[PDB]
Amino acid sequence: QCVKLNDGHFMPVLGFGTYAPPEVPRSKALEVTKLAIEAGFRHIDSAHLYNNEEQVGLAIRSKIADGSVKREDIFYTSKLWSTFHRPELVRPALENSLKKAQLDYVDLYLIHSPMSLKPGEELSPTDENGKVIFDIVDLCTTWEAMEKCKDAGLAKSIGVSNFNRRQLEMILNKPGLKYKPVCNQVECHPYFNRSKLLDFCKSKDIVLVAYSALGSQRDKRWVDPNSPVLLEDPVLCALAKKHKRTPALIALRYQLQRGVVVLAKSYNEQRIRQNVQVFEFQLTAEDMKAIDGLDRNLHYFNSDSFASHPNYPYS
Ligand SMILES: NC(=O)c1ccc[n+]([C@@H]2O[C@H](COP(=O)([O-])OP(=O)(O)OC[C@H]3O[C@@H](n4cnc5c(N)ncnc54)[C@H](OP(=O)(O)O)[C@@H]3O)[C@@H](O)[C@H]2O)c1
Ligand SMILES: COc1ccc2c(c1)c(CC(=O)O)cn2C(=O)c1ccc(Cl)cc1
Ligand SMILES: COc1ccc2c(c1)c(CC(=O)O)cn2C(=O)c1ccc(Cl)cc1
Structure with a gap:
């Protein structure tokens, strides 16, 4: 149950998401x-x-x-x-x-985000006005160093995350490129299905890896409070009843059948074990087109400040 990456290595199509907010004890x-x-x-x-x-x-x-x-x-x-x-x-x-x-x-090392920040020990560097400090870096030079990490044997494969088409193309068209990114890990779910980016990625033999595939953790730090809850979607719920599965399973299966590698974060034993059931059933072609219709260009990750970053991916 793996997809072959463009460097010859293999990636399991279902991945476990590990991020949990600080209120969750690290032992979890x-x-x-x-x-x-x-x-x-x-x-x-x-x-x-x-x-x-x-x-x-x-x-x-x-x-x-x-x-x-x-x-x-x-x-x-x-x-x-x-x-x-x-x-x-x-x-x-x-x-x-x-x-x-x-x-x-x-097995895989990614550039987490194209939005460079001030080098230092803080994850979020802020000036004396409390504003986050951007940095200007040619991501092609970053990529060059990533390539050296793959050759150094420290990363079997290398890729990117939260890149858009233009940004991906800057790497793909870099003079003297040694390794294409094996993947682009981006926000992807029925409310933001990234179909155009997915098509491009496929044409370049780059895997699209979906995060917030279950609608995100709705973290107060970046969620739109008024945004709809993915797993409460009437269409998803009707499909779950039809197949006698769950809305989450419908959402994960959606990605698998469109050739997307899909992540799923859960810190709950039973949901963790439920999520592997994604390999047990199929959605019909008509099912898939129905879910395709749910797209509403909705990102669950929002940031007014970063929207002004020169490398903001959604502009
Ligand atoms: N590259 C990036 O910038 C980026 C951004 C976001 C995420 N990611 C990666 O992708 C992973 C997942 O994306 P995500 O963190 O936004 O969360 P997610 O996969 O969209 O899942 C969101 C919520 O779904 C719940 N859930 C899981 N399985 C379920 C099920 N079978 N039924 C009902 N609810 C279920 C979980 O709550 P419970 O824990 O209570 O089960 C979880 O908090 C992250 O952990 C991280 O590894 C990467
Ligand atoms: C303090 O905790 C943080 C801080 C920043 C985070 C995240 C979590 C995540 C979730 C994860 O990777 O699971 C994404 N971030 C991003 O910067 C990000 C970058 C670009 C885009 Cl388009 C969306 C999110
Ligand atoms: C504590 O360390 C960090 C590091 C990065 C962070 C944050 C916190 C937050 C929360 C907050 O600033 O309130 C957002 N970040 C982002 O870069 C971000 C950028 C774009 C998007 Cl779409 C979402 C998050």
């Missing part, structure tokens, strides 16, 4: 990642940003030691945070993630 990450592996998840999505690589790395270590899986069975993703876009900072950032997770390599 450890617990639930073990449950996910136990439930059958093999693709695990983390990031320096998430303050959990240590716990996720431990879960993997633990499941390897008890014989449940081997390292080669696990597909582990980390991401370069935006304060580390300057080329000389890329490898050290990766090495730090590897040290935290106690891993020798990541």
Whole structure:
């Protein structure tokens, strides 16, 4: 149940999302990642940003030691945070993630976001007016350093996240490009299905990886309070009744059948185990077109301040 990436490696089409807000104890990450592996998840999505690589790395270590899986069975993703876009900072950032997770390599390393921020120790650098400080970096130089990370053996594959078509093309058209990004991890769900970006990605043999595929965690820091709740969508719910599944399963299956690799975050054992059932049923072609009609250009991640970033992807 994997897709072949354009560098020859394989990515499981269903991945476990690991981000949880700060109110969630860090020990939970450890617990639930073990449950996910136990439930059958093999693709695990983390990031320096998430303050959990240590716990996720431990879960993997633990499941390897008890014989449940081997390292080669696990597909582990980390991401370069935006304060580390300057080329000389890329490898050290990766090495730090590897040290935290106690891993020798990541299966996939991504540029988390094209919106570069001031280099430093703060994840969100702010000036004396409390305004977040942008940085200007040629992402092609960042990519060059990512390429060196793949050659250094520290990342089996490299890709990007939250890039738009133009931004993807800047990398694809870079003089002397060695490695195309294997994927672009972007917000993708029935209310923002990214069909045009998906088509482009396919034409370039780049995998689109969907996040907030279940409608996001509706975190107060970036959600629109008035935005509809994805999993309460009448069409999704009617399809769930028809197939005797759940709205979540319909949403995940939607992505699988359109050739999208899909992430699913849950810190709940039963929902974690429910989510792997996505391989148990099929949506009809008519089902798929019906879901396609739900698109409303709705992103669950909003930021007025970042909307003014020169590399804001949604402009
Ligand atoms: N590259 C990026 O910038 C970026 C951005 C966002 C996310 N991501 C990645 O993608 C992952 C998932 O995206 P997401 O964090 O926005 O959350 P999500 O996958 O859209 O899931 C959102 C919520 O769905 C609930 N849920 C899960 N399974 C369910 C089920 N079977 N039935 C009903 N509800 C269910 C979970 O609550 P419970 O925990 O209570 O089950 C979760 O909080 C993240 O964890 C992260 O790894 C990356
Ligand atoms: C403090 O916690 C944070 C801070 C920033 C975050 C996130 C979480 C996430 C969720 C995750 O990756 O799971 C995305 N972020 C982004 O910057 C982002 C960048 C570009 C776009 Cl278009 C959307 C989100
Ligand atoms: C504590 O460290 C961080 C780092 C990055 C953060 C944040 C917090 C927040 C929450 C807040 O600032 O209130 C948003 N961020 C983003 O970059 C962001 C950019 C674009 C979008 Cl669409 C969403 C989030």
